[PDB]
Amino acid sequence: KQGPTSVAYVEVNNNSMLNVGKYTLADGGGNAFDVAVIFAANINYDTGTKTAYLHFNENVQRVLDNAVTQIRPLQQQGIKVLLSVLGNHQGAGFANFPSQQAASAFAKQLSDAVAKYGLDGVDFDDQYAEYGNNGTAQPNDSSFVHLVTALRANMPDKIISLYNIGPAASRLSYGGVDVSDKFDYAWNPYYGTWQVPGIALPKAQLSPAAVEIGRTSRSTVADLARRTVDEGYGVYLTYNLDGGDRTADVSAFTRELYGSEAVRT
């Protein structure tokens, strides 16, 4: 059990977080997955007040409300559980907070959730915001910087990761500060592709590869897992693992990343 940190996004709208723990290495019995990501909470907008607010749909809330059975078991296994935040077509996004005050208010909701439900961190996925909807402004230079600065200040010992996509991802500097080193990980958003995140983080914390379990061919899965190890990258991003039998799809990257087949319980 040595090798790249494998990440697993799970669409909690349809699937349980618990499948992530079902795969172990036939060699040593280590976890096939090191980080599980709850996908996902949203950034909504209150037009009347012109303020954004964090929002969990009924499915996201169910797993959170049920943390003890859906989350703790992964954590007791040694698997880190993060919560991903994504746009929700309301004009409000991570890149258009009008002020440091507004940004910090949103950061607080995220850190409060992490603390409340016993999470290991937050993940930013800047897609679907639709900047401009509801009289909102387009992305700016300070918003994302203000947001990450605030989030890191109040939760210093947690994981902060970035889905390398959307306006925010390319807005890491403002004032005199680069929030690059405030993140722990950053990864390629395009499944079935290689794409080295441009963020100034060391290879140990970057995942140029992104695959969708059950959709990306095992040929491309193994190929990217191989390149990840060869080129010296420390992370391997996986998405949409479900409850069906995915042992061969998982073994396809574990053979390359950890030199072991995967096994399912």
Side-chain angles (χ1 to χ4, degrees):
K1 170 29 68 169
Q2 320 276 189
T5 294
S6 47
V7 175
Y9 275 68
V10 174
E11 284 270 355
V12 294
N13 267 353
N14 318 282
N15 302 109
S16 171
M17 288 298 302
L18 294 163
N19 296 126
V20 173
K22 295 172 188 299
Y23 301 88
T24 57
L25 303 185
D27 207 281
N31 295 140
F33 297 101
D34 302 311
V35 181
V37 176
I38 305 155
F39 188 94
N42 304 96
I43 168 162
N44 273 36
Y45 193 55
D46 184 328
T47 311
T49 60
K50 263 86 203 131
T51 86
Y53 64 94
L54 176 64
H55 163 229
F56 309 134
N57 63 236
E58 264 196 56
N59 306 308
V60 178
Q61 192 61 249
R62 181 118 72 261
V63 357
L64 248 23
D65 277 349
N66 282 113
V68 159
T69 57
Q70 309 291 129
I71 303 176
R72 299 300 173 267
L74 298 189
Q75 290 170 313
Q76 288 169 210
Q77 227 183 117
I79 298 174
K80 256 82 171 57
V81 188
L82 276 44
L83 169 63
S84 191
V85 205
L86 80 162
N88 194 205
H89 325 262
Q90 289 172 33
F94 312 139
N96 65 343
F97 279 102
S99 62
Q100 185 286 144
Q101 188 158 218
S104 186
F106 198 79
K108 177 191 315 83
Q109 297 182 91
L110 291 162
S111 38
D112 274 352
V114 164
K116 182 178 179 194
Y117 303 111
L119 277 26
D120 295 301
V122 168
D123 170 70
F124 287 105
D125 188 351
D126 192 12
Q127 293 184 96
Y128 305 128
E130 304 182 2
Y131 298 92
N133 275 1
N134 293 133
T136 47
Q138 290 308 134
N140 56 229
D141 291 340
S142 55
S143 176
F144 204 48
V145 175
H146 287 326
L147 181 51
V148 183
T149 297
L151 186 60
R152 178 53 74 191
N154 59 43
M155 64 167 211
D157 81 290
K158 299 296 161 167
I159 299 175
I160 297 184
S161 64
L162 179 67
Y163 226 61
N164 188 47
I165 195 177
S170 50
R171 296 171 160 81
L172 296 166
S173 303
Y174 181 74
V177 194
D178 197 319
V179 298
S180 296
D181 61 1
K182 300 199 149 76
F183 285 97
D184 292 291
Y185 303 126
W187 36 62
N188 178 29
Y190 308 104
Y191 307 117
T193 76
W194 181 267
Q195 231 239 156
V196 181
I199 181 171
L201 271 173
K203 295 200 184 185
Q205 291 154 53
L206 300 176
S207 183
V211 303
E212 188 193 325
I213 301 287
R215 238 307 184 86
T216 298
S217 67
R218 312 216 251 247
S219 171
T220 301
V221 170
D223 185 49
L224 296 171
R226 264 197 307 269
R227 186 162 180 146
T228 298
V229 176
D230 274 4
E231 322 263 60
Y233 285 101
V235 192
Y236 183 78
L237 199 284
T238 256
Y239 165 88
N240 213 182
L241 171 77
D242 66 358
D245 176 4
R246 257 42 185 224
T247 300
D249 298 285
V250 170
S251 303
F253 70 76
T254 53
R255 273 183 219 116
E256 320 308 338
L257 305 173
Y258 321 120
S260 179
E261 297 288 7
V263 90
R264 190 192 211 277
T265 48

